[PDB]
Amino acid sequence: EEKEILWNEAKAFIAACYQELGKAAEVKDRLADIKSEIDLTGSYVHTKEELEHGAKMAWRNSNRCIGRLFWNSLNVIDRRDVRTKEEVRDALFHHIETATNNGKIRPTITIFPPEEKGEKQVEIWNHQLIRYAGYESDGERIGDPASCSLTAACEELGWRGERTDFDLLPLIFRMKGDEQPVWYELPRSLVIEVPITHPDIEAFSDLELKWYGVPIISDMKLEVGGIHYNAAPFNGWYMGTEIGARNLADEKRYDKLKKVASVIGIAADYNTDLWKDQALVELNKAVLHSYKKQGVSIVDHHTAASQFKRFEEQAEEAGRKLTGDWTWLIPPISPAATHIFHRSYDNSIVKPNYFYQDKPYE
């Protein structure tokens, strides 16, 4: 059954990929080559062109992503050659450096060897390559609560966090054949962070907020033509609301709205004053301003939605069906001010794509 699944997914992907690449005449010989290889080995190996276009197709098919206009300019780094933990570490360090690009962020993906028989070659524990630790003990909350379980797991492995609100988690990953993951501290010279200030309100710096420059999702599986790349971290640049309306605002994240209300000089006493809404707007203005001031790439939700409209137009003009998840595409502030809110989207799953996978901790 498993080989049949592979072959069926392979046929569909190669035909579509080669069609898009104007290589339709080569489909038949490639398909034969693949079928023999599956028969003889139980799997097949993508060409570099297939891997690159496959990762791009996967982004294009990601229903929850508003940033898809730029799918075809993804920078794909082929690291299927890695065999050691030092090579994985250096490849992750390199991804951070080249994606960051001194603040002019390059959307990038680094692709490690795929699963063989469901057996992972490299298993990354981090949710993002750069993220803050979280602690909870005796009523005391420190840092990012979303990171509490991973932080606890790291501290089982001999790591110890300083317990500031912004401790950088180490990289943590496991190699096939090892019982435990290894961890490596991130070189601070690689990690750009942005202090949050406000364009008009000088007191906003009293909150001492900051966030990291580049969000690099490292716990999703890339699936391309039946091949499962469980380790394939990728990044774009932030849309401001991710930081200002969620990471810093959610009650189960940094929960800063009451403190924001106080520094911008408004009462946080009555629902009818809409103080949470006003605080959200000012915090989100501050996030956009601060990233821009430091020369780190970011996009606001209005510009992002306009770009997504162009993605919709491009899909239709190219004759491709559009898929999307309305509930994730609408931004968490002023959604009705974007065109997304006022139309609907087919939430069907098309492959290649990025998928959730079970955590190895928890």
Add this chain to the structure above:
Amino acid sequence: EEKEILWNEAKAFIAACYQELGKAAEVKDRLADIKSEIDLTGSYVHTKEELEHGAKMAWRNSNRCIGRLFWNSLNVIDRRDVRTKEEVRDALFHHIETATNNGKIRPTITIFPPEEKGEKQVEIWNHQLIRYAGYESDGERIGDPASCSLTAACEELGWRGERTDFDLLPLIFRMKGDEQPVWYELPRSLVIEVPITHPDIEAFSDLELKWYGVPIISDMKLEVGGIHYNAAPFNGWYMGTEIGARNLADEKRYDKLKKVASVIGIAADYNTDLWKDQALVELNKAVLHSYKKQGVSIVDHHTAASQFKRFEEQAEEAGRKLTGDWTWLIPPISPAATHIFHRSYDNSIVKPNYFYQDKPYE
């Protein structure tokens, strides 16, 4: 087939209704009475208790409505006795007066005779009993564009609007056996309106905005136990975002955000300044403040979501499944600041309920 549908819907409704009313022992005799009546007449007539509880169940089952905590206090007016257009008009006038209640709004529904064989007895053309006209001619937009088609239809019937931005449409409805609907001008003494001012910004009155006090949906069908009440206007009170984030803000409605930005003294030049978001917040604060200042009922979206949380808790505690439409329940500003955004809802249709029906104009 049609009688069978009726009987099946009747069985399900009476059992559930009588169960809720602690009248379970009476279900069998009532069901027999109904079955004979369907056989002999092709239909059946609800008791006043059934009609009242049915309309309440229908509200409770309305997936898109955040205001459902108060379903059991709906004021149900039984007007199945009306036979003339003067009686319908006076009943609609009365609904406005008693629902308005000098500003302390009473959630109310007036129920007219139901369809007989799909044949309507009374056909209401208005979308809401109180709404503003809209005009579009030679590049000139006046009033509410959502009302353009109904306004044009009214002006076919001898009505003429003054062409202010806030012309009250007349009541317009058709009686069984008449080819054309009739129209009646609304007595202004019945219609409460609220001028929009801002708590801190004196210039906000320069926009000369206003809105009407009571939203009274008059074009939906109430279905109860297989009986189709196509004419059954109902109202609650406004949630502020309906007015400030949509009616006055949508580009295809009153489109006031640029003017709002100007009176609150901010530039409307750069997406990254989040001027639309800031304008939305101030306009929404102004709407809440103005309704409160005038003593007209209104609820903010935070309080409304908290009430909806209690509705969820009440449903579970009563052993009823909860249904809801996430895409309509989330408010259009700061949705991620409400609990609704962070959970999911089963969007299944349960009856009794309120349904869309085809417009008689357009």
